[PDB]
């Protein structure tokens, strides 16, 4: 899986960054508990736009 | 001696009656075949 972080997570951090994870760690923990979301193209574009605007 | 046919109207209708035939897909198959052959007596319900 590829996920865009929505919070800070120990051992894989950088809140609001794109990181690849195992499918289970991210389908069964991260997304349901609210840390990170799936890294679809729309989400990637939205995050890129926000980072570009805040740069 | 006791023979094989021991009549009972309730059992006859429960086993071979029109509603018993209509309750099952294979019973409706039997009814369709009998209608196609053109039987005047469709089921034991027709008899008296």
């Amino acid at each position: 899986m590829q996920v865009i972080l929505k919070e800070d997570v120990v051992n894989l951090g950088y809140k609001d960054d794109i990181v690849t994870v195992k499918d289970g760690y991210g389908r069964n923990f991260l997304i349901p508990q609210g840390k990170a979301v799936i890294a679809s193209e729309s989400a990637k574009k939205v995050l890129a736009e926000n980072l570009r605007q805040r740069a | 001696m006791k023979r094989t046919y021991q009549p009972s109207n309730r059992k006859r209708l429960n086993k071979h009656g029109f509603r018993s035939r209509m309750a099952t897909a294979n019973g409706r198959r039997v009814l369709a075949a009998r209608r196609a052959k053109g039987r005047a007596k469709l089921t034991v319900s027709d008899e008296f």
């Binding site: 899986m1 499918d23 799936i38 679809s40 | -």
Partner: protein, 77 residues
Amino acid sequence: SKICQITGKKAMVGNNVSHSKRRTKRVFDVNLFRKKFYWVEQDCWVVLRISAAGLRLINKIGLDAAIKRAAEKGFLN
């Protein structure tokens, strides 16, 4: 209706083939299971009867896209 709700996969029919080429009818079953998913876009929980292939598609394109695709293709019901 034992069938994957995301891909529409159902059981296949084939043969067991022995070394002497004896052929016996058999069914290839789907790696099917029931799983619960958190729908983020609707903020709720859903239960889907899916295959491992359906789970791969969900983990590839997200749950919302997979559900909308399956509904468009008719697999969802």
